[PDB]
Amino acid sequence: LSDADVQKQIKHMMAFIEQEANEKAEEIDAKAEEEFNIEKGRLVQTQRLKIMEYY
Amino acid sequence: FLPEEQAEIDQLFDALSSDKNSPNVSSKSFSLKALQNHVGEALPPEMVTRLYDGMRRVDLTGKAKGPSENVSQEQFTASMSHLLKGNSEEKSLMIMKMISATEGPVKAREVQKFTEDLVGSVVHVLSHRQELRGWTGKEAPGPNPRVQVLAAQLLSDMKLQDGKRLLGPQWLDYDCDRAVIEDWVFRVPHVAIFLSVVICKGFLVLCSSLDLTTLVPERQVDQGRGFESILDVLSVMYINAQLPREQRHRWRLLFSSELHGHSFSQLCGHITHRGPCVAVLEDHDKHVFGGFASCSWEVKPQFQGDNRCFLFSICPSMAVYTHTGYNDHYMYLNHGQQTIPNGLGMGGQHNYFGLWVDVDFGKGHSRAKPTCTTYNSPQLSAQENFQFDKMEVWAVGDKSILDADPEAQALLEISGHSRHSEGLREV
Amino acid sequence: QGIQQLLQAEKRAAEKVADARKRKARRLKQAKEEAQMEVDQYRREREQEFQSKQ
Protein backbone atom coordinates (compact mmCIF):
# COMPACT_ATOMS: atom_id res chain seq x y z
CA LEU A 1 0.00 0.00 0.00
CA SER A 2 2.87 2.34 0.89
CA ASP A 3 5.22 1.40 -1.98
CA ALA A 4 2.37 1.66 -4.50
CA ASP A 5 2.29 5.41 -3.79
CA VAL A 6 6.06 5.93 -3.98
CA GLN A 7 6.40 3.95 -7.22
CA LYS A 8 4.17 6.49 -8.98
CA GLN A 9 6.09 9.52 -7.65
CA ILE A 10 9.35 8.23 -9.14
CA LYS A 11 7.60 8.46 -12.51
CA HIS A 12 6.68 12.12 -11.90
CA MET A 13 10.15 13.29 -12.95
CA MET A 14 12.11 10.25 -14.23
CA ALA A 15 10.29 9.70 -17.55
CA PHE A 16 7.96 12.71 -17.71
CA ILE A 17 10.06 15.86 -17.21
CA GLU A 18 13.60 14.46 -17.36
CA GLN A 19 12.61 12.87 -20.67
CA GLU A 20 11.84 16.36 -22.00
CA ALA A 21 15.44 17.45 -21.47
CA ASN A 22 16.05 14.74 -24.07
CA GLU A 23 13.22 16.29 -26.11
CA LYS A 24 14.77 19.75 -25.82
CA ALA A 25 18.10 18.20 -26.85
CA GLU A 26 17.31 16.56 -30.18
CA GLU A 27 15.62 19.69 -31.55
CA ILE A 28 18.98 21.34 -31.97
CA ASP A 29 18.94 18.93 -34.92
CA ALA A 30 16.27 21.18 -36.41
CA LYS A 31 18.52 24.18 -35.84
CA ALA A 32 21.68 22.54 -37.19
CA GLU A 33 20.03 21.58 -40.48
CA GLU A 34 19.05 25.21 -41.11
CA GLU A 35 22.68 26.28 -40.63
CA PHE A 36 23.79 23.54 -43.03
CA ASN A 37 21.57 24.95 -45.78
CA ILE A 38 22.95 28.47 -45.30
CA GLU A 39 26.48 27.30 -46.18
CA LYS A 40 24.97 25.10 -48.91
CA GLY A 41 23.44 28.26 -50.35
CA ARG A 42 26.45 30.45 -49.57
CA LEU A 43 28.74 28.18 -51.62
CA VAL A 44 26.36 27.61 -54.53
CA GLN A 45 25.25 31.24 -54.90
CA THR A 46 28.90 32.33 -54.92
CA GLN A 47 30.03 29.74 -57.50
CA ARG A 48 26.98 28.93 -59.64
CA LEU A 49 26.97 32.65 -60.44
CA LYS A 50 30.60 32.17 -61.53
CA ILE A 51 30.81 28.82 -63.35
CA MET A 52 27.64 29.57 -65.32
CA GLU A 53 28.67 33.15 -66.15
CA TYR A 54 31.68 31.65 -67.97
CA TYR A 55 29.37 29.78 -70.33
CA PHE B 1 -34.24 23.53 -22.77
CA LEU B 2 -35.02 26.93 -21.33
CA PRO B 3 -38.70 27.93 -21.80
CA GLU B 4 -37.49 30.79 -23.99
CA GLU B 5 -36.05 28.07 -26.25
CA GLN B 6 -38.73 25.48 -25.42
CA ALA B 7 -41.29 27.96 -26.77
CA GLU B 8 -39.90 28.27 -30.31
CA ILE B 9 -38.83 24.64 -30.84
CA ASP B 10 -42.44 23.49 -30.74
CA GLN B 11 -43.35 26.61 -32.72
CA LEU B 12 -41.39 25.13 -35.62
CA PHE B 13 -42.98 21.67 -35.46
CA ASP B 14 -46.58 22.88 -35.09
CA ALA B 15 -46.38 24.72 -38.42
CA LEU B 16 -44.70 21.77 -40.17
CA SER B 17 -47.13 18.91 -39.52
CA SER B 18 -50.06 20.99 -40.85
CA ASP B 19 -48.99 20.46 -44.48
CA LYS B 20 -51.63 20.77 -47.19
CA ASN B 21 -49.95 19.14 -50.19
CA SER B 22 -49.23 15.81 -48.41
CA PRO B 23 -52.60 14.09 -47.94
CA ASN B 24 -52.25 10.86 -45.91
CA VAL B 25 -50.74 12.49 -42.80
CA SER B 26 -52.04 13.37 -39.35
CA SER B 27 -51.57 16.38 -37.07
CA LYS B 28 -48.88 14.79 -34.85
CA SER B 29 -46.44 14.07 -37.69
CA PHE B 30 -45.16 15.48 -40.99
CA SER B 31 -43.66 13.91 -44.10
CA LEU B 32 -40.52 14.60 -46.13
CA LYS B 33 -42.21 16.74 -48.80
CA ALA B 34 -42.75 19.73 -46.50
CA LEU B 35 -39.26 19.59 -44.98
CA GLN B 36 -37.97 20.41 -48.48
CA ASN B 37 -40.52 23.26 -48.65
CA HIS B 38 -39.91 25.95 -46.01
CA VAL B 39 -36.14 25.81 -46.51
CA GLY B 40 -36.75 27.00 -50.09
CA GLU B 41 -33.48 28.17 -51.61
CA ALA B 42 -31.56 28.53 -48.33
CA LEU B 43 -30.15 24.99 -48.48
CA PRO B 44 -28.68 22.84 -51.29
CA PRO B 45 -30.49 19.64 -52.37
CA GLU B 46 -27.75 17.32 -51.05
CA MET B 47 -28.31 18.39 -47.42
CA VAL B 48 -32.11 18.69 -47.13
CA THR B 49 -32.33 14.98 -47.90
CA ARG B 50 -29.77 14.40 -45.13
CA LEU B 51 -31.91 16.75 -43.05
CA TYR B 52 -34.50 13.97 -43.33
CA ASP B 53 -32.46 10.77 -42.99
CA GLY B 54 -30.33 12.07 -40.12
CA MET B 55 -33.33 12.89 -37.94
CA ARG B 56 -35.37 9.80 -38.83
CA ARG B 57 -32.96 7.13 -37.53
CA VAL B 58 -33.43 8.10 -33.89
CA ASP B 59 -34.29 5.19 -31.59
CA LEU B 60 -36.56 6.42 -28.81
CA THR B 61 -38.24 3.29 -27.41
CA GLY B 62 -35.59 0.62 -28.04
CA LYS B 63 -37.50 -2.14 -29.84
CA ALA B 64 -37.99 -1.14 -33.49
CA LYS B 65 -35.97 -2.49 -36.42
CA GLY B 66 -34.97 0.96 -37.67
CA PRO B 67 -36.35 4.37 -38.58
CA SER B 68 -39.96 5.52 -38.50
CA GLU B 69 -41.79 6.69 -41.60
CA ASN B 70 -43.36 9.84 -40.12
CA VAL B 71 -41.26 12.13 -37.94
CA SER B 72 -43.03 13.35 -34.80
CA GLN B 73 -42.24 15.94 -32.12
CA GLU B 74 -40.68 13.24 -29.95
CA GLN B 75 -38.47 12.37 -32.94
CA PHE B 76 -37.77 16.08 -33.55
CA THR B 77 -37.08 17.56 -30.09
CA ALA B 78 -34.70 14.69 -29.24
CA SER B 79 -32.50 15.32 -32.30
CA MET B 80 -31.99 18.98 -31.36
CA SER B 81 -31.43 17.62 -27.85
CA HIS B 82 -28.62 15.63 -29.46
CA LEU B 83 -27.24 18.47 -31.60
CA LEU B 84 -28.00 21.93 -30.19
CA LYS B 85 -27.17 21.04 -26.59
CA GLY B 86 -25.92 17.46 -26.67
CA ASN B 87 -22.53 16.01 -25.83
CA SER B 88 -19.85 14.33 -27.96
CA GLU B 89 -21.32 10.84 -27.48
CA GLU B 90 -24.63 12.33 -28.71
CA LYS B 91 -23.35 14.77 -31.35
CA SER B 92 -21.53 12.43 -33.76
CA LEU B 93 -24.42 9.99 -33.34
CA MET B 94 -26.39 12.23 -35.72
CA ILE B 95 -23.28 12.47 -37.88
CA MET B 96 -22.91 8.72 -38.51
CA LYS B 97 -26.69 8.04 -38.50
CA MET B 98 -26.91 10.56 -41.36
CA ILE B 99 -24.46 8.68 -43.63
CA SER B 100 -25.53 5.07 -44.18
CA ALA B 101 -28.99 3.53 -44.20
CA THR B 102 -27.49 0.61 -42.28
CA GLU B 103 -26.01 0.87 -38.80
CA GLY B 104 -22.30 0.24 -38.36
CA PRO B 105 -18.93 1.91 -38.89
CA VAL B 106 -19.18 4.37 -41.75
CA LYS B 107 -16.43 3.99 -44.34
CA ALA B 108 -13.66 6.58 -44.71
CA ARG B 109 -14.53 7.30 -48.35
CA GLU B 110 -18.10 8.41 -47.67
CA VAL B 111 -17.40 10.58 -44.65
CA GLN B 112 -15.31 12.58 -47.12
CA LYS B 113 -18.39 12.95 -49.33
CA PHE B 114 -20.40 14.19 -46.35
CA THR B 115 -17.59 16.57 -45.39
CA GLU B 116 -17.83 18.08 -48.87
CA ASP B 117 -21.62 17.99 -48.45
CA LEU B 118 -21.46 20.25 -45.39
CA VAL B 119 -18.99 23.05 -46.13
CA GLY B 120 -20.57 23.69 -49.51
CA SER B 121 -23.82 24.39 -47.64
CA VAL B 122 -22.60 26.78 -44.93
CA VAL B 123 -21.73 29.16 -47.79
CA HIS B 124 -25.22 28.52 -49.18
CA VAL B 125 -27.13 29.33 -46.00
CA LEU B 126 -24.96 32.33 -45.06
CA SER B 127 -25.32 33.90 -48.52
CA HIS B 128 -29.07 33.27 -48.72
CA ARG B 129 -29.54 34.79 -45.26
CA GLN B 130 -27.27 37.77 -46.19
CA GLU B 131 -24.75 37.73 -43.33
CA LEU B 132 -21.55 37.90 -45.40
CA ARG B 133 -20.53 41.39 -44.15
CA GLY B 134 -18.91 42.14 -47.51
CA TRP B 135 -17.00 38.85 -47.83
CA THR B 136 -18.76 37.61 -50.98
CA GLY B 137 -16.07 35.29 -52.28
CA LYS B 138 -16.92 34.58 -55.91
CA GLU B 139 -18.18 31.07 -56.59
CA ALA B 140 -16.54 29.27 -59.48
CA PRO B 141 -18.78 27.89 -62.27
CA GLY B 142 -18.11 24.26 -61.60
CA PRO B 143 -16.95 23.26 -58.13
CA ASN B 144 -15.51 25.83 -55.77
CA PRO B 145 -11.88 24.76 -55.18
CA ARG B 146 -11.77 26.26 -51.68
CA VAL B 147 -14.70 24.10 -50.55
CA GLN B 148 -12.67 21.04 -51.52
CA VAL B 149 -9.30 21.81 -49.92
CA LEU B 150 -10.97 23.06 -46.74
CA ALA B 151 -13.01 19.87 -46.28
CA ALA B 152 -9.99 17.58 -46.46
CA GLN B 153 -8.19 19.69 -43.85
CA LEU B 154 -10.73 18.67 -41.20
CA LEU B 155 -10.06 15.01 -42.05
CA SER B 156 -6.37 15.49 -41.23
CA ASP B 157 -7.24 15.57 -37.52
CA MET B 158 -9.10 12.28 -38.08
CA LYS B 159 -6.93 10.17 -35.82
CA LEU B 160 -7.76 6.52 -36.43
CA GLN B 161 -7.06 4.13 -33.55
CA ASP B 162 -3.80 2.93 -35.16
CA GLY B 163 -2.11 6.26 -34.41
CA LYS B 164 -1.18 6.68 -38.08
CA ARG B 165 -2.88 9.35 -40.18
CA LEU B 166 -4.82 8.96 -43.43
CA LEU B 167 -2.02 8.51 -46.00
CA GLY B 168 -2.07 7.19 -49.58
CA PRO B 169 -4.97 5.62 -51.52
CA GLN B 170 -5.70 3.32 -48.55
CA TRP B 171 -7.30 6.36 -46.85
CA LEU B 172 -10.78 5.61 -48.23
CA ASP B 173 -11.46 2.20 -46.63
CA TYR B 174 -11.43 2.65 -42.84
CA ASP B 175 -14.27 1.16 -40.79
CA CYS B 176 -14.74 4.40 -38.85
CA ASP B 177 -17.10 3.54 -35.99
CA ARG B 178 -18.48 5.76 -33.18
CA ALA B 179 -15.21 5.07 -31.31
CA VAL B 180 -13.25 7.29 -33.71
CA ILE B 181 -15.66 10.04 -34.82
CA GLU B 182 -16.40 11.07 -31.23
CA ASP B 183 -13.01 12.71 -30.66
CA TRP B 184 -13.10 14.24 -34.14
CA VAL B 185 -16.08 16.42 -33.19
CA PHE B 186 -14.22 17.04 -29.90
CA ARG B 187 -10.95 18.09 -31.58
CA VAL B 188 -12.35 20.01 -34.57
CA PRO B 189 -14.51 22.94 -33.38
CA HIS B 190 -15.79 23.92 -36.83
CA VAL B 191 -17.56 20.64 -37.58
CA ALA B 192 -19.39 21.43 -34.34
CA ILE B 193 -19.87 25.09 -35.36
CA PHE B 194 -21.02 24.56 -38.97
CA LEU B 195 -23.92 22.28 -37.96
CA SER B 196 -25.22 25.12 -35.77
CA VAL B 197 -25.51 27.44 -38.78
CA VAL B 198 -26.91 25.14 -41.46
CA ILE B 199 -29.74 24.15 -39.12
CA CYS B 200 -30.32 27.25 -36.99
CA LYS B 201 -30.27 29.90 -39.73
CA GLY B 202 -32.72 28.62 -42.33
CA PHE B 203 -35.03 27.50 -39.52
CA LEU B 204 -34.63 31.02 -38.05
CA VAL B 205 -34.52 30.35 -34.31
CA LEU B 206 -33.84 33.86 -33.01
CA CYS B 207 -33.30 32.80 -29.38
CA SER B 208 -30.00 31.09 -30.28
CA SER B 209 -27.06 32.00 -28.04
CA LEU B 210 -24.42 31.71 -30.77
CA ASP B 211 -22.10 34.45 -32.02
CA LEU B 212 -22.03 35.22 -35.74
CA THR B 213 -19.94 38.38 -35.31
CA THR B 214 -16.91 36.28 -34.34
CA LEU B 215 -17.42 33.45 -36.88
CA VAL B 216 -17.30 35.57 -40.05
CA PRO B 217 -15.41 38.88 -39.71
CA GLU B 218 -16.65 42.15 -41.19
CA ARG B 219 -14.89 43.33 -44.33
CA GLN B 220 -14.20 47.07 -43.90
CA VAL B 221 -12.95 48.57 -47.14
CA ASP B 222 -13.43 52.25 -47.96
CA GLN B 223 -16.26 52.73 -50.45
CA GLY B 224 -15.96 54.07 -53.99
CA ARG B 225 -13.25 51.59 -55.04
CA GLY B 226 -14.41 48.42 -56.72
CA PHE B 227 -12.20 45.97 -54.90
CA GLU B 228 -12.26 42.17 -54.98
CA SER B 229 -9.97 40.31 -52.59
CA ILE B 230 -7.68 37.31 -52.99
CA LEU B 231 -9.32 35.46 -50.12
CA ASP B 232 -12.87 34.15 -50.45
CA VAL B 233 -15.14 33.56 -47.48
CA LEU B 234 -14.09 30.00 -46.57
CA SER B 235 -10.47 31.14 -46.43
CA VAL B 236 -11.21 34.17 -44.24
CA MET B 237 -13.22 31.83 -42.03
CA TYR B 238 -10.10 29.69 -41.80
CA ILE B 239 -7.50 32.34 -40.90
CA ASN B 240 -9.93 34.02 -38.47
CA ALA B 241 -10.06 30.82 -36.41
CA GLN B 242 -6.39 30.87 -35.38
CA LEU B 243 -6.22 34.54 -34.42
CA PRO B 244 -6.85 35.70 -30.86
CA ARG B 245 -10.57 35.79 -30.11
CA GLU B 246 -10.51 39.51 -29.34
CA GLN B 247 -9.80 40.58 -32.94
CA ARG B 248 -11.90 38.23 -35.08
CA HIS B 249 -14.75 40.64 -35.91
CA ARG B 250 -13.35 43.15 -38.40
CA TRP B 251 -10.81 42.86 -41.22
CA ARG B 252 -9.88 46.29 -42.53
CA LEU B 253 -7.99 46.94 -45.76
CA LEU B 254 -4.45 48.25 -45.30
CA PHE B 255 -2.62 47.59 -48.58
CA SER B 256 -3.67 45.92 -51.81
CA SER B 257 -1.56 45.75 -54.95
CA GLU B 258 -4.35 46.43 -57.45
CA LEU B 259 -5.47 49.66 -55.74
CA HIS B 260 -2.42 51.22 -54.04
CA GLY B 261 0.15 50.47 -56.72
CA HIS B 262 2.72 47.73 -57.12
CA SER B 263 5.32 49.38 -54.90
CA PHE B 264 7.13 48.35 -51.76
CA SER B 265 7.40 52.00 -50.69
CA GLN B 266 3.60 52.08 -50.66
CA LEU B 267 3.46 48.73 -48.83
CA CYS B 268 5.88 49.94 -46.16
CA GLY B 269 3.90 53.18 -45.88
CA HIS B 270 0.46 51.64 -45.53
CA ILE B 271 1.17 48.76 -43.12
CA THR B 272 3.66 50.40 -40.76
CA HIS B 273 2.14 51.56 -37.44
CA ARG B 274 -1.33 50.03 -37.93
CA GLY B 275 -1.33 47.26 -35.33
CA PRO B 276 -1.61 43.53 -35.96
CA CYS B 277 -2.34 42.70 -39.57
CA VAL B 278 -2.57 39.69 -41.87
CA ALA B 279 -0.37 39.73 -44.95
CA VAL B 280 -1.55 37.34 -47.65
CA LEU B 281 -0.18 37.02 -51.17
CA GLU B 282 -0.59 34.82 -54.25
CA ASP B 283 2.19 34.01 -56.69
CA HIS B 284 2.15 32.93 -60.35
CA ASP B 285 1.50 29.24 -59.64
CA LYS B 286 -1.78 29.89 -57.73
CA HIS B 287 -0.19 29.20 -54.34
CA VAL B 288 -1.88 31.51 -51.80
CA PHE B 289 0.03 31.88 -48.54
CA GLY B 290 1.15 34.56 -46.13
CA GLY B 291 1.45 35.29 -42.44
CA PHE B 292 0.05 37.21 -39.50
CA ALA B 293 1.90 39.77 -37.39
CA SER B 294 0.96 40.03 -33.72
CA CYS B 295 2.20 43.57 -33.10
CA SER B 296 2.64 46.63 -35.33
CA TRP B 297 5.08 46.64 -38.20
CA GLU B 298 7.97 48.99 -37.54
CA VAL B 299 10.96 49.66 -39.78
CA LYS B 300 14.01 48.53 -37.82
CA PRO B 301 16.89 46.08 -38.37
CA GLN B 302 16.11 43.92 -35.34
CA PHE B 303 13.82 40.93 -35.28
CA GLN B 304 10.54 42.15 -33.81
CA GLY B 305 7.36 40.35 -32.75
CA ASP B 306 6.33 37.65 -30.29
CA ASN B 307 4.81 34.18 -30.18
CA ARG B 308 1.38 34.94 -31.68
CA CYS B 309 2.74 35.48 -35.20
CA PHE B 310 2.02 32.54 -37.48
CA LEU B 311 2.30 31.51 -41.11
CA PHE B 312 -0.54 29.82 -42.96
CA SER B 313 -1.51 28.45 -46.36
CA ILE B 314 -4.76 28.54 -48.33
CA CYS B 315 -4.79 27.53 -52.01
CA PRO B 316 -2.27 24.64 -52.18
CA SER B 317 -3.46 23.29 -48.83
CA MET B 318 -4.99 24.73 -45.69
CA ALA B 319 -2.66 24.53 -42.72
CA VAL B 320 -1.46 26.86 -39.96
CA TYR B 321 1.99 26.84 -38.35
CA THR B 322 2.40 28.43 -34.91
CA HIS B 323 5.69 29.22 -33.21
CA THR B 324 8.22 26.68 -31.93
CA GLY B 325 10.36 28.97 -29.78
CA TYR B 326 13.69 27.72 -31.12
CA ASN B 327 14.39 31.34 -32.05
CA ASP B 328 12.42 34.56 -31.78
CA HIS B 329 13.17 35.68 -35.35
CA TYR B 330 9.52 36.53 -35.90
CA MET B 331 9.17 39.60 -38.13
CA TYR B 332 11.51 41.85 -40.10
CA LEU B 333 11.24 45.14 -42.00
CA ASN B 334 14.07 47.13 -43.60
CA HIS B 335 13.79 49.91 -46.11
CA GLY B 336 16.91 50.76 -48.07
CA GLN B 337 20.14 49.74 -46.41
CA GLN B 338 23.06 47.87 -47.97
CA THR B 339 24.54 45.36 -45.50
CA ILE B 340 21.35 43.66 -44.23
CA PRO B 341 18.41 42.66 -46.49
CA ASN B 342 15.76 45.15 -47.56
CA GLY B 343 12.18 43.90 -47.51
CA LEU B 344 9.56 42.15 -45.42
CA GLY B 345 10.40 38.83 -43.78
CA MET B 346 8.98 36.31 -41.34
CA GLY B 347 10.71 33.27 -39.87
CA GLY B 348 14.15 31.79 -40.31
CA GLN B 349 17.11 34.18 -40.21
CA HIS B 350 18.79 36.71 -42.52
CA ASN B 351 18.52 35.67 -46.22
CA TYR B 352 16.99 32.35 -45.10
CA PHE B 353 13.46 33.46 -44.30
CA GLY B 354 10.40 31.24 -44.27
CA LEU B 355 8.52 34.04 -46.02
CA TRP B 356 10.21 37.00 -47.67
CA VAL B 357 8.94 39.88 -49.81
CA ASP B 358 11.70 41.90 -51.44
CA VAL B 359 11.95 45.60 -52.23
CA ASP B 360 12.02 44.83 -55.97
CA PHE B 361 8.29 44.31 -55.72
CA GLY B 362 6.74 41.14 -57.10
CA LYS B 363 9.50 38.82 -55.93
CA GLY B 364 10.43 36.80 -52.88
CA HIS B 365 11.21 33.40 -51.45
CA SER B 366 10.22 30.85 -48.88
CA ARG B 367 13.53 29.05 -48.44
CA ALA B 368 12.43 26.80 -45.58
CA LYS B 369 13.71 23.78 -47.49
CA PRO B 370 13.19 20.96 -44.88
CA THR B 371 10.87 23.10 -42.73
CA CYS B 372 11.16 26.46 -41.03
CA THR B 373 12.93 27.06 -37.73
CA THR B 374 10.72 29.54 -36.02
CA TYR B 375 7.41 28.20 -37.29
CA ASN B 376 8.03 24.53 -38.31
CA SER B 377 6.54 25.62 -41.63
CA PRO B 378 7.36 24.18 -45.07
CA GLN B 379 8.34 25.76 -48.34
CA LEU B 380 5.19 27.76 -49.04
CA SER B 381 5.55 28.56 -52.73
CA ALA B 382 5.80 26.14 -55.64
CA GLN B 383 9.38 27.19 -56.47
CA GLU B 384 12.22 28.35 -54.28
CA ASN B 385 11.96 31.98 -55.46
CA PHE B 386 8.44 32.92 -56.52
CA GLN B 387 7.00 35.98 -58.27
CA PHE B 388 3.61 37.45 -57.40
CA ASP B 389 1.12 39.99 -58.73
CA LYS B 390 -1.58 40.19 -56.02
CA MET B 391 -0.80 41.05 -52.41
CA GLU B 392 -3.12 41.97 -49.54
CA VAL B 393 -2.43 43.21 -46.03
CA TRP B 394 -5.49 43.18 -43.76
CA ALA B 395 -5.58 44.66 -40.27
CA VAL B 396 -7.64 42.72 -37.74
CA GLY B 397 -9.86 44.46 -35.21
CA ASP B 398 -8.70 47.87 -34.04
CA LYS B 399 2.86 67.07 -46.48
CA SER B 400 5.65 65.98 -48.83
CA ILE B 401 9.34 66.82 -48.62
CA LEU B 402 8.96 69.22 -51.55
CA ASP B 403 6.64 71.49 -49.55
CA ALA B 404 8.08 70.86 -46.08
CA ASP B 405 10.88 73.41 -45.91
CA PRO B 406 10.28 76.82 -47.54
CA GLU B 407 13.81 77.98 -46.67
CA ALA B 408 15.49 75.03 -48.38
CA GLN B 409 13.57 75.66 -51.60
CA ALA B 410 14.75 79.25 -51.17
CA LEU B 411 18.36 78.13 -50.67
CA LEU B 412 18.21 75.60 -53.52
CA GLU B 413 17.07 78.29 -55.96
CA ILE B 414 19.76 80.67 -54.66
CA SER B 415 22.54 78.08 -54.99
CA GLY B 416 21.86 77.72 -58.72
CA HIS B 417 20.11 74.35 -58.63
CA SER B 418 16.87 74.42 -60.59
CA ARG B 419 13.45 72.99 -59.81
CA HIS B 420 12.98 70.54 -62.77
CA SER B 421 9.20 70.53 -62.22
CA GLU B 422 6.82 73.44 -62.25
CA GLY B 423 3.43 72.81 -63.75
CA LEU B 424 3.95 69.06 -63.30
CA ARG B 425 3.07 68.68 -59.61
CA GLU B 426 -0.05 69.90 -57.78
CA VAL B 427 -0.09 71.98 -54.60
CA GLN C 1 16.23 5.70 -4.06
CA GLY C 2 15.09 8.97 -5.58
CA ILE C 3 17.89 11.47 -4.91
CA GLN C 4 20.41 8.63 -5.13
CA GLN C 5 19.02 7.82 -8.59
CA LEU C 6 17.81 11.20 -9.90
CA LEU C 7 21.25 12.18 -11.21
CA GLN C 8 21.43 8.72 -12.82
CA ALA C 9 18.49 9.93 -14.92
CA GLU C 10 20.25 13.28 -15.41
CA LYS C 11 23.57 11.89 -16.63
CA ARG C 12 21.62 9.92 -19.24
CA ALA C 13 19.76 13.18 -19.91
CA ALA C 14 22.93 15.22 -20.43
CA GLU C 15 24.42 12.44 -22.59
CA LYS C 16 21.67 12.87 -25.19
CA VAL C 17 22.63 16.44 -26.13
CA ALA C 18 26.36 15.73 -26.55
CA ASP C 19 25.48 13.44 -29.46
CA ALA C 20 23.14 16.20 -30.63
CA ARG C 21 26.04 18.66 -30.65
CA LYS C 22 28.43 16.13 -32.19
CA ARG C 23 25.94 15.55 -35.01
CA LYS C 24 25.64 19.34 -35.37
CA ALA C 25 29.43 19.71 -35.64
CA ARG C 26 29.30 16.96 -38.26
CA ARG C 27 26.38 18.34 -40.31
CA LEU C 28 28.41 21.44 -41.16
CA LYS C 29 31.10 19.47 -43.01
CA GLN C 30 28.81 16.52 -43.78
CA ALA C 31 27.73 17.78 -47.20
CA LYS C 32 30.03 20.71 -47.84
CA GLU C 33 31.57 18.05 -50.05
CA GLU C 34 28.12 17.74 -51.62
CA ALA C 35 28.20 21.53 -51.74
CA GLN C 36 31.02 20.81 -54.16
CA MET C 37 28.61 18.47 -55.98
CA GLU C 38 27.25 21.63 -57.59
CA VAL C 39 30.46 21.37 -59.63
CA ASP C 40 28.73 18.31 -61.05
CA GLN C 41 25.83 20.59 -62.02
CA TYR C 42 28.37 22.62 -64.02
CA ARG C 43 28.68 19.61 -66.34
CA ARG C 44 25.08 19.79 -67.59
CA GLU C 45 25.62 23.34 -68.86
CA ARG C 46 28.97 22.52 -70.48
CA GLU C 47 27.75 19.63 -72.64
CA GLN C 48 24.71 21.79 -73.38
CA GLU C 49 27.09 24.56 -74.44
CA PHE C 50 28.74 21.78 -76.44
CA GLN C 51 25.22 21.03 -77.72
CA SER C 52 24.56 24.60 -78.84
CA LYS C 53 27.99 24.43 -80.47
CA GLN C 54 27.03 21.07 -81.99
Author numbering:
A (entry chain d): 3 to 57
B (entry chain U): 16 to 413, 424 to 452
C (entry chain g): 6 to 59
Study text:
The V1 domain, containing sixteen subunits (A3B3CDE3FG3H), catalyzes the hydrolysis of ATP by the A3B3 heterohexamer to trigger the V1–Vo torque transmission via subunits DF. In this manuscript, we discovered that mEAK7, a lysosomal surface-anchored protein, can bind the V1 domain of intact V-ATPase and may function as an inhibitor of V-ATPase.
Since the yield of endogenous V-ATPase from HEK293 cells is low, we employed the endogenously purified V-ATPase from bovine brain to perform all in vitro assays. The structural analysis showed that human mEAK7 could form a complex with bovine V-ATPase similar to human V-ATPase.
